[PDB]
């Protein structure tokens, strides 16, 4: 199930992040109530700090495609998101030594920056 995104074993979390990344490509622009990674943004704030470098990077690219699937209406709730998300993104995504873990974290911040009215 989806609740396996917080499962103990890493390779089962790694699935859920890929499963999610599909969801945000393949699900509805209008958006299923199953797309509730807005009104609890603590979820992905947790996922970005995964405690596994490979399953972390996969959570960030799921957050990334989520965070561009949200350029559809109405998502005025991007204020809450920047508060919850970019501190984890900066603290441990930009920080990362991993080439791709960093590159997608910056891209994520970009997408949160243009969610906002200004910088």
């Amino acid at each position: 199930l989806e609740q396996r995104a917080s499962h103990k074993v890493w390779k089962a979390r790694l699935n859920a992040y890929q499963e999610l990344n599909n969801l945000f490509t393949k699900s509805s622009v209008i958006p299923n109530d199953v797309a509730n990674y807005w009104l609890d943004p603590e979820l992905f704030a947790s996922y970005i700090v995964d405690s596994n470098v490979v399953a972390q990077e996969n959570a960030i690219i799921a957050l990334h495609t989520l965070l561009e699937y949200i350029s559809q209406v109405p998502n005025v709730s991007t204020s809450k998101l920047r508060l919850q998300w970019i501190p984890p993104l900066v603290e441990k995504g930009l920080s990362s030594s991993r080439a791709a873990t960093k590159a997608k974290a910056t891209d994520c911040i970009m997408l949160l920056t243009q969610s906002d009215t200004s910088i």
């Binding site: 393949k26 509805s28 622009v29 209008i30 209406v73 109405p74």
Partner: protein, 247 residues
């Protein structure tokens, strides 16, 4: 810079024109009585005018006898000249057919798409286009679907072509919570697939446009779910129209 409606022109009243020997002539057993009766008000009373009276004019006595013939009248000629009357009302009296008027003729018209005589299908469909362009999608969206599910092959292909006609001229902009989305997957798509999967090719081929005119409106990604369930062979026919179709 805003534009004008040319409709500001003063209106004309036709109620006084009708003759005493009209109700009995339309309700007669002799076909030529009915035809002439209808044909007279069309060539003499409706065709001349260019704007009917919005204020305080009840046509829902006249319109319900146009329906009575369009549905049940055995004379295909009396149907043809009636649906052209219906169109004239809906055309010269825009913004009138809110419900009572539009709904009084809507389901009769959809029944009579069964007619295959080109001149008659011309007149019935063009009148359906009138009631739609001034009442879309009040009652038609629902009832148009109903008659896509109908047993006669002709009414299926014609009422589906109707949804196609309407969909090309479908209008914005509320939020994306218009009547089309409330019932999109639940009803519109489930019913358009019944056309797409019909036994006849000419029926199926109308569905293929009416699905590619649908994707154009509501995103080829949203409907990729029932696309997968469809044949790979039907898929490339649907896509064929998607590339040509405009809304």
């Amino acid at each position: 810079n805003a534009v004008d409606p040319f409709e500001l022109l003063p209106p004309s009243v036709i109620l006084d024109k009708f003759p005493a020997d009209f109700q009995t002539r339309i309700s007669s057993t002799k076909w030529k009585d009915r035809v002439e009766a209808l044909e007279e008000i069309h060539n003499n009373v409706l065709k001349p005018v260019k704007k009917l009276a919005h204020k305080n004019q009840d046509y829902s006595d006249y319109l319900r006898v146009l329906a009575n013939v369009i549905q049940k009248d055995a004379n295909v000629q009396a149907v043809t000249i009636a649906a052209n009357s219906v169109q004239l009302l809906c055309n010269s009296l825009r913004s009138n057919f809110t419900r009572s008027y539009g709904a009084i003729v809507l389901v009769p018209l959809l029944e009579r798409t069964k007619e295959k005589k080109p001149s008659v299908n011309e007149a019935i469909c063009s009148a359906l286009d009138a009631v739609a362009t001034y009442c879309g999608f009040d009652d038609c969206l629902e009832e148009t679907l109903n008659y896509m599910k109908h047993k006669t092959p002709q009414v299926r292909i014609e009422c589906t072509k109707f949804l196609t006609r309407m969909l090309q001229g479908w209008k914005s902009d509320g939020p994306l919570q218009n009547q089309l989305l409330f019932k999109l997957l639940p009803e519109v798509t489930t019913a358009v697939l019944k056309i797409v999967n019909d036994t006849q090719p000419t029926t199926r081929n109308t569905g293929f446009e009416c699905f590619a005119t649908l994707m154009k409106l509501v995103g080829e990604r949203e409907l990729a779910d029932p696309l997968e369930k469809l044949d790979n062979l039907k898929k490339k026919k649907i896509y064929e129209y998607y590339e040509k179709v405009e809304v």
